[PDB]
Amino acid sequence: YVEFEPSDKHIKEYLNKIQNSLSTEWSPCSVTCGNGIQVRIKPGSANKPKDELDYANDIEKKICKMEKCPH
Numbered sequence: 095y096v097e098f099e100p101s102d103k104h105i106k107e108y109l110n111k112i113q114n115s116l117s118t119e120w121s122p123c124s125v126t127c128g129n130g131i132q133v134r135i136k137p138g139s140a141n142k143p144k145d146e147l148d149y150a151n152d153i154e155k156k157i158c159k160m161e162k163c164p165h
Contacts, residue, residue, distance in 0.1 A: 108133065109149075117135060120134045124158070125160055128162070128163045130158050134153070135154075136152055
């Protein structure tokens, strides 16, 4: 069945997109309408170099829900 949840592949794509502003503060929502994701670096991972961030353990994710997408 259709999952209706954000996929890890797509969240990793967003991490590439916002990598320059990625920090311990939540990112902007990945979308301007409908459902997307916000990401941040876990505070306990703030000392790590960019090339040693584990997706599952060093990155926090949360669903964000924006206004209904217009036609």
